[PDB]
Amino acid sequence: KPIRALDEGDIALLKTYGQSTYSRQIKQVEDDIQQLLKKINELTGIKESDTGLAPPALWDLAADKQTLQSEQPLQVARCTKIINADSEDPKYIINVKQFAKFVVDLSDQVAPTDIEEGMRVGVDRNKYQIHIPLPPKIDPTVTMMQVEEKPDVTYSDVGGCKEQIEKLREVVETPLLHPERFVNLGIEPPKGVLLFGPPGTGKTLCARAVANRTDACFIRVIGSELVQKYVGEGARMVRELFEMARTKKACLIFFDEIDAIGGDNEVQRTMLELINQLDGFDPRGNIKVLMATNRPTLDPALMRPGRLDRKIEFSLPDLEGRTHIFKIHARSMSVERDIRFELLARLCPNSTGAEIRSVCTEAGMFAIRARRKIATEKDFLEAVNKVIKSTPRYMTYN
């Protein structure tokens, strides 16, 4: 049936008749409210907008003007191949960022010994002479770094990696704290070791655990940090890091998620710098390196013998390991003292350690849901039901 479009009289009668008596007043009032809101919003202004002006009496405006009229700015750049100067060809080609690259010479104020390939250099703007090398500095405040000297994770805080922790002990504790046995055995202590396994197995903290018990400082370096914005200078960064590794009495240098690097000009520069630092530093030293990855993408030039002596697989935790992790993470939360953690570890087959920590977190979540200050075994049951498993298994298996 052809439906009729509303006519003018139809529209006019629709807006009336079946209307609330207060339609006009209410709609108008809401419109004025919105208009007044926009009025206030436009008239209230912005305010400061207070620039970084120091308190007075700290101002040397005379000297400030002197610097403005005397000192000059320098564009920074990443210096590249030295062109084999030998005091007669001191030119280097430098890449000023997204700007061009120029072959330039030095300023009289810098010796060539201070300038080398791959360091940030501040240069002038017309002659582009390298005026001052600009080392990127090292500080845990920037990026993320080792930020640890004596980790608070002990051998009692690790579980499920008994064979793995034993292998790690042979790797690090035996050459470091017992060099005499390696020396009189006439065997080079393990120069390189790799710790491969799925993420969340626990790998990092395991090393951190031994880092507390090896009486040496722990180093955390993230491969993504080397590959993200902190790329380029990162080589020099690790240079300084390796340098400070030499300064300390013993360093447990470890790189997190090396997959971001092991699998790219500046990335290759950082890699070859790592190769020089490892193959160059004397294997008899005490700064033994711990390597770990999730994807066993590593370049074939790395695991050649003499760079990675041992490989350790960190498999998923077993029943004893999973229940140990459950108890460890329950030590830090308010629960009853009669929780069957063996039950839960059974209920979490092939579950990562991070998954166990999340399970404990969700158990606390459920306890909070009922506003009970003590988490119950029921709470952990719902937590594992939620996290793990992301009729069939009960109507056929019994």
């Binding site: 052809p2 439906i3 479009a5 509303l6 529209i11 629709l14 807006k15």
Partner: protein, 58 residues
Amino acid sequence: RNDSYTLHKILPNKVDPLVSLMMVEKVPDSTYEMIGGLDKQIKEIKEVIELPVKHPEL
């Protein structure tokens, strides 16, 4: 300004040409009288296109 960078005029709001061209400035010549059938379809369109716009009061 030239290179003093002084705000000296306020211009209409920024619309880059790639979308500024998508206005139908020159309306096409096609009427419903040139559309056979589709009367039900035309009504269903009109109930969504201009009926909400012409009179949102209903």
